[PDB]
Amino acid sequence: VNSFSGYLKLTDNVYIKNADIVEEAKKVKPTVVVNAANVYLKHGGGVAGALNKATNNAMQVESDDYIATNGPLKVGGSCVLSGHNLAKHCLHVVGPNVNKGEDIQLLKSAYENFNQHEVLLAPLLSAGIFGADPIHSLRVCVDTVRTNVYLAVFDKNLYDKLVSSFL
């Protein structure tokens, strides 16, 4: 039993809710919140910009030190950093950005990072400003993630379409 509330159950291990991931994280304080990161951990907009803003830019400060030490992530890769006031940890995961011409096949590799964590609060990878089809992202999530994932979808219209079209 966990404290995630109001989710629709899609499969044995995948749950979904129309919610602002920032507000969900502040309420639940999950062990892991997933950020929709880019390889430079520049949290300018989308989910990343919102999460970083909620940390009063502490996420960005920590991320800049991470990059200065380690260099950029790989597309499809991840790193674990602090969750600041939102969660114990933040798993920064880089899905492919279609608006950069990045290979959508890398979306499966991106979701594989979730399997290193027993329970996660997450957005749909490569959705929103990353330009991929969110219906496809949900399909890859369900077919790749085996750990318990609670998906927050900000847009109510999109949430309803994801549920109604789910096979």
Domain 8-163 has CATH 3.40.220.10: yes
Number of H helices, E strands in the chain: 6, 7
For residue 87, with 0-12 CB atoms within 10 Å meaning exposed, 13-18 middle and 19 or more buried, which class applies?
Answer: buried
Rg (CA), the chain: 14
For 71, the token pair is 């260099």
For 95, the token pair is 């899905």
DSSP-H helix ranges across 55-155: 58-70, 106-112, 134-144
The torsion region of residue 85 among left (phi > 0), alpha (psi -120 to 50) and beta comes to alpha
Nearest to 20 by CA among 47, 57, 59: 47
Q: Count of alpha carbons within 13 Å of 153, Cβ hemisphere only?
A: 22
Distances in whole angstroms, Cα of residue 121 to Cα of each of 21, 33, 68, 101: 8, 5, 27, 27
* Residues in contact with 124: Cβ distance below 8 Å, sequence separation at least 6, in sequence order: 134, 137, 138, 141, 151, 153
- Domain boundary assignment for the chain: 8-163
Experimental resolution (Å): 1.0
